[model samples]
Target: GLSSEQQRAFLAVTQTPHPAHLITGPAGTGKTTLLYALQEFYKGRAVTLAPTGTAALQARGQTVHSFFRFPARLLRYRHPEDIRPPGPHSPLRKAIEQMEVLILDEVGMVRVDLLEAMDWALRKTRKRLEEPFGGVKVLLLGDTRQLEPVVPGGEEALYIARTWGGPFFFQAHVWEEVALRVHRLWESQRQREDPLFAELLKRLRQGDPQALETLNRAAVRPDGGEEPGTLILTPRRKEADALNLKRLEALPGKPLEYQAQVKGEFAETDFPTEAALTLKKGAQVILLRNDPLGEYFNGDLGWVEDLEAEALAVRLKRNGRRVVIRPFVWEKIVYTYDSEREEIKPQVVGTFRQVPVRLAWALTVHKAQGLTLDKVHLELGRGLFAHGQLYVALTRVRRLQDLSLSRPIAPTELLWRPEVEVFETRIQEGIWQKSH
Candidate 1:
């Protein structure tokens, strides 16, 4: 359920034609869900785009960079004094011409130069699409409270608070004119999961400079009798080991596992791999690869829905829907199952086989963007610096309670740091300065 304010905002955007909207908030705030719902409201008539990373691509639209094909260093070349034409055959141009609504997720990760490129691209596209598509609605979703732009010595790196009083605040002003700002407050259900943790997150968002450090400490703190949960931090092996050990030793009776989840789709046919030929109808299989450029691999997880001696038919399930898949050409099989001991044998059992094996577990967060999950355990801890990463991680869960965070997250880590604050402020300023 949405709050009255949120509901009002939702209605305003859905009812208006070609209205540019912006949804900004800290991590755990439901920006992604809202964008998805908004896309649904348009009933697939609109185009969605994300600024960076694979997760961004999975967001309702396409990636902004992909859409524009604009160079990553577009900003380095052009300045206020330079005038460059939009690239030929730009996807952004085509999208603007045909797309009814354009949704851009994770705007925070966009570099300052990239932001300038976007500004130029949009202005150029809008000019071309004139009349009917002149007012193509654009939705920008991000949280300034999280990660800042990756530029060095750039003003956009400053956090939101410091920029609030500076010329950088002008960027916020520019966004207000072209886009409607919608603030999503934390719901009670969200608070109940961990009130202290929620409050700490809120405080950090409010400009507390030490929030990140506090969160790091809390993540490794002893949980006593609490249940062990996953923590979605950066994939640093050493840090991961330290975090894993701390959780296991501090929390009595609670089990903890740390591993990276491999992401790839399986193949049904045995043309390439003899081992694949052994797969029977209703055989459970793990996905080995999902190459978008390759034939018959559209991010589908292959399940042996039907089988034959030399060929097999598979079904791929994603977003709760199943699609049939068959390999196009023969390629060398890259994976095989080893069966030596009776205790851990890989046997072709009945229609649907369930094999119990001990292996490293990969959490839902690590799964590549666009990959769907059946069931997973999520780790919600402090020290998450990127708002997009947090948004990307949490929304992977289709339902609540599928997500979990290690207990006793520190007040500081869950909050903001001075450096992060400075970074965000600079970003806001950069957006404004560049816009002008």
Candidate 2:
């Protein structure tokens, strides 16, 4: 199911002997799909990681912080002793020591300090102090234009810049030594049917003034001319939750509440859906996990047709098929060392059992990162605040015609970081050498 371009990109990442590599493209270019292929190829020799829980879920992997057991604060690169490694004979220690390839999906969300911390931990744990990532193959994936790394406080940004030169992963000292070979995918699979809109999105990604003007002229809908199945895209989680609550309250019939059953060690922040999920008949919803039978995907939008105590019937928007969704289990795993086999294996420490459906009337831009929606409404209340936030919001729909903006995007709202531009230029130039 890959395009010619995607197939070529996949081959380049897997076949090449390069210790460090990057696979990047705009949204819907099959970056995530390619990652799935790479996971299959590498199999047990690699561990795919992400900077966030949702991204980790998409990659069927673990979070970087969770995998490394690193602290949430800014890290120091030169201090390997500062990082605490697992005890000898520990499974976590074996996991790090035996890891052959590190597939870091959504590399854009990883900050410089965290990357350095990874480098420190790997070099020390694997006892390869002279090599970057302890000579482990590092494969970085994701578009830099989608999400920026979060720096919690004002002073933190200043501290990061002062110490690491910048907050981005590219600014890390290990990056310079690693010399990651960049392989970029150019096709836009999500908007392939709408070539003109895809071109406009390309321009919008580069912060072209004319593209913004054209987008504003075509997408501005003051009266909210939203389509029947259009999902609202928002900048903040609170706003999205408020909109979902409002829409749920307006729907007819008494709400059916389904509480998630949890057992051992599952964090509240990592819950796939609400612990107490309330849904009514005819309420719009989205799938949180892929169906085992391949009938529906994680981001597929649907309407609640019927509700039972244990299951719900959902009518998918893409097709008119009605599916009876059962409660799914999401496992919380910890890597354990199998002494007899001399291998590291995942041991499920906890489980969260719940129906894999959430109210989909509105979703945050961050949550909608990899979803391909048919129609989207931009709820730009105070305008986008983060870099690439506008581009992410605009590119969610299939075509320009399917998108409705609450208002025109301000010129100031279109933010682009200079470091990202520099890195992107290298990718454009096809520079794979160490000295760029």
Candidate 3:
């Protein structure tokens, strides 16, 4: 059953003829589930987009950068005409023209200029000069408390601060014009059984002084030793890869290599796991996809029990249930307008086929965004760099007892941007109420 919050958000989006909505909450508050419902409701008229490949893949949609043909670098503040729009009959133009609702997932990571570019492109392609996003309804889903938009260098940061006042999507010029209705989901489904942990997370988000001390007290590992089925979570990819490789070789048996079958134009960055996965008999691994039968969920850890050409058996650490996993296909899609059917539909342009298991001795906290892990050893190599790195890592586990920090967090690591805080305050005060 849908909660009143979710139901209201759904009704708000569906009832409005031209909606600009934000459904935001902490992780596991069912934002994705609401996204699914909206997608189903809009059917052929809506298209989903995300900031990164992994998130786009998880949302089963196309990356915003890829879809909009926006550059990876910070947008240099160009007028609508300065940037070229899709041609009259181009697939991009057709897609934009047909899209009624644009569901943007992980909006927290979307930069200000990227969103401006989207607005410019949509307005240009759809020939709707007066309306924001070419009159297409925009539904943004994600908690800004999870991940902040990446502003690479000082120059980029300066540019963002000067041009748009902040790097977040909400700060985009178009956002002021759109005036998106903010709907915050109150309950967290992931940590519902552990209300204390959920409360700690809430405190962490608001930068409560006592939260960090309480967190370190409960989760700190006093005696450092090997954790058999536990994965080391770090913010950097290089560290995660190195740890996985070192741990895999340290295990005693011949490594079993599984090469993923790739077809079409799948970007290397979008890969769910390694193209050539190597594992030993006793190698620690994690499930990538949730089991259809409810036996194992994504982020469930296990040790390799048996290996074959296509399938492998993994003994789960959570319940000791052995699950046989085979190769699964992850599709890369592009939305196109079908004139005959009068609809916008996603067409698979690429595929990545591989086993839904990855070496789980270590993982990047960025990649572990939506996952709920049973056990995690925090390895803050050079300390956390992003806004919610510590909070994200800590909230991944159900209990504080299942977490172990490599070292106590530095004061600098608990960084919160003032701009975000101000924005959140306005949302809380309901300053930008829905206008008729």
TM-score of each: 0.48, 0.90, 0.88
**Candidate 1 C-alpha lDDT tens digits along 235-283:** 3334443443443345323232222211232223211122212233443
Off by over 4 Å in 3: 1-8, 26-33, 154-156, 186-219, 222-229, 384-388, 429-436
lDDT of each: 0.42, 0.76, 0.76
Which regions of candidate 1 fall more than 4 Å away from where they truly are?
Answer: 1-9, 24-34, 40-45, 74-94, 128-134, 152-173, 176-179, 183-185, 193-196, 203-436
Per-residue lDDT tens digits of candidate 3, residues 64-92? 88888876676777564445687777888
Prediction-by-prediction clash tally: 30, 0, 0
lDDT of 2 at 152: 76
Best model number under TM-score: 2
* Stretches of model 2 off by over 4 angstroms after superposition: 1-10, 25-37, 86-90, 186-190, 384-388, 429-436
Please say which candidate is ahead in TM-score: 2 or 3. 2
Worst 10 residues of 1 by lDDT: 350-359
> What's the residue-level lDDT of 301 in candidate 2?
84
Q: What value does the lDDT take at residue 273 in candidate 2? A: 76
What is the RMSD of candidate 3? Answer: 3.2
